[PDB]
Design a protein around this motif. Structure first.
Motif, short mmCIF file in Angstrom:
data_model
loop_
_atom_site.label_atom_id
_atom_site.label_comp_id
_atom_site.label_asym_id
_atom_site.label_seq_id
_atom_site.Cartn_x
_atom_site.Cartn_y
_atom_site.Cartn_z
N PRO B 34 0.88 -1.16 0.00
CA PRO B 34 0.00 0.00 0.00
C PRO B 34 0.93 1.22 0.00
O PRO B 34 2.01 1.14 0.55
CB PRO B 34 -0.75 -0.13 1.33
CG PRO B 34 0.22 -0.87 2.22
CD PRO B 34 0.95 -1.82 1.30
N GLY B 35 0.49 2.31 -0.64
CA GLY B 35 1.31 3.53 -0.68
C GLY B 35 2.26 3.54 -1.86
O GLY B 35 2.41 2.49 -2.51
N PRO B 36 2.92 4.68 -2.16
CA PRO B 36 3.76 4.80 -3.35
C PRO B 36 5.21 4.38 -3.14
O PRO B 36 5.54 3.92 -2.07
CB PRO B 36 3.73 6.31 -3.57
CG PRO B 36 3.77 6.86 -2.17
CD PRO B 36 2.92 5.90 -1.36
N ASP B 37 6.02 4.51 -4.19
CA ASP B 37 7.48 4.21 -4.10
C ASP B 37 7.73 2.75 -3.76
O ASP B 37 8.73 2.49 -3.08
CB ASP B 37 8.23 5.19 -3.20
CG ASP B 37 9.70 5.30 -3.55
OD1 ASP B 37 10.01 5.48 -4.75
OD2 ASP B 37 10.53 5.19 -2.63
N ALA B 38 6.82 1.84 -4.16
CA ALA B 38 7.10 0.40 -3.98
C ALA B 38 7.90 -0.04 -5.21
O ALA B 38 8.53 -1.11 -5.18
CB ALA B 38 5.82 -0.38 -3.86
N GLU B 39 7.91 0.82 -6.24
CA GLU B 39 8.59 0.46 -7.50
C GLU B 39 10.08 0.25 -7.23
O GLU B 39 10.70 -0.48 -8.00
CB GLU B 39 8.35 1.51 -8.59
CG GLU B 39 8.42 2.94 -8.08
CD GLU B 39 7.15 3.43 -7.41
OE1 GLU B 39 6.31 2.59 -7.05
OE2 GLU B 39 7.01 4.66 -7.26
N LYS B 40 10.66 0.95 -6.26
CA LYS B 40 12.08 0.65 -5.95
C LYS B 40 12.13 -0.81 -5.49
O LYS B 40 12.99 -1.56 -6.00
CB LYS B 40 12.62 1.60 -4.89
CG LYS B 40 11.96 1.53 -3.52
CD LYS B 40 12.53 2.55 -2.55
CE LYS B 40 11.80 2.58 -1.22
NZ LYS B 40 12.54 3.39 -0.22
N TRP B 41 11.17 -1.21 -4.65
CA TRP B 41 11.11 -2.63 -4.21
C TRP B 41 10.83 -3.51 -5.43
O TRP B 41 11.46 -4.56 -5.53
CB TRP B 41 10.03 -2.81 -3.14
CG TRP B 41 10.07 -1.79 -2.06
CD1 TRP B 41 9.09 -0.89 -1.75
CD2 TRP B 41 11.14 -1.55 -1.13
NE1 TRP B 41 9.48 -0.11 -0.69
CE2 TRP B 41 10.73 -0.49 -0.29
CE3 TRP B 41 12.41 -2.12 -0.93
CZ2 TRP B 41 11.54 0.00 0.73
CZ3 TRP B 41 13.20 -1.63 0.08
CH2 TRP B 41 12.78 -0.58 0.90
N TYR B 42 9.94 -3.07 -6.32
CA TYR B 42 9.60 -3.89 -7.50
C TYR B 42 10.87 -4.09 -8.33
O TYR B 42 11.12 -5.21 -8.76
CB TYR B 42 8.61 -3.16 -8.40
CG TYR B 42 7.16 -3.25 -7.99
CD1 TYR B 42 6.71 -2.65 -6.83
CD2 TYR B 42 6.24 -3.93 -8.77
CE1 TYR B 42 5.38 -2.71 -6.45
CE2 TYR B 42 4.91 -4.01 -8.41
CZ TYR B 42 4.48 -3.40 -7.25
OH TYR B 42 3.16 -3.48 -6.90
N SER B 43 11.64 -3.03 -8.53
CA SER B 43 12.84 -3.13 -9.39
C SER B 43 13.84 -4.08 -8.73
O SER B 43 14.43 -4.89 -9.45
CB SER B 43 13.46 -1.78 -9.64
OG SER B 43 13.85 -1.17 -8.42
#
Lengths: 48, 48
Positions: B34-43
């Motif tokens: 939930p929430g933004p900036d999970a894309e660093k985790w996704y990458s």
């Protein structure tokens, strides 16, 4: 891609290897199309 | 060592997953925080 043999002569037509979910979503679009085509106001193959 | 064990005494609450819309990965369902900036985790999770 399934063990059962089926004729596909348009494999030249571009396609990636869709996940089961991707095929299911395309299938859901086909189902919505069929319901609108028969003007179906009731849910169709929803469990499917 | 005991403290590392103590610090890892946690229960992982079941998360949610989202299909990849890009060709960088094979349209996988990524655990979505939930929430933004999970894309660093996704990458990091999917360097590909």
């Amino acid at each position: 891609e399934t063990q059962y043999p089926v004729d596909r002569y348009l494999d030249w037509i571009p396609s990636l290897r869709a996940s089961a979910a991707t095929a299911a979503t395309f299938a859901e679009w086909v189902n919505t199309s069929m319901k609108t085509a028969f003007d179906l106001s009731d849910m169709l193959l929803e469990p499917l | 060592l005991l403290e590392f064990v103590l610090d890892n005494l946690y229960l992982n609450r079941h998360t949610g997953f989202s299909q990849d819309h890009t060709p960088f990965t094979e349209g996988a369902n990524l655990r979505s925080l939930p929430g933004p900036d999970a894309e660093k985790w996704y990458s990091i999770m999917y360097p590909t």
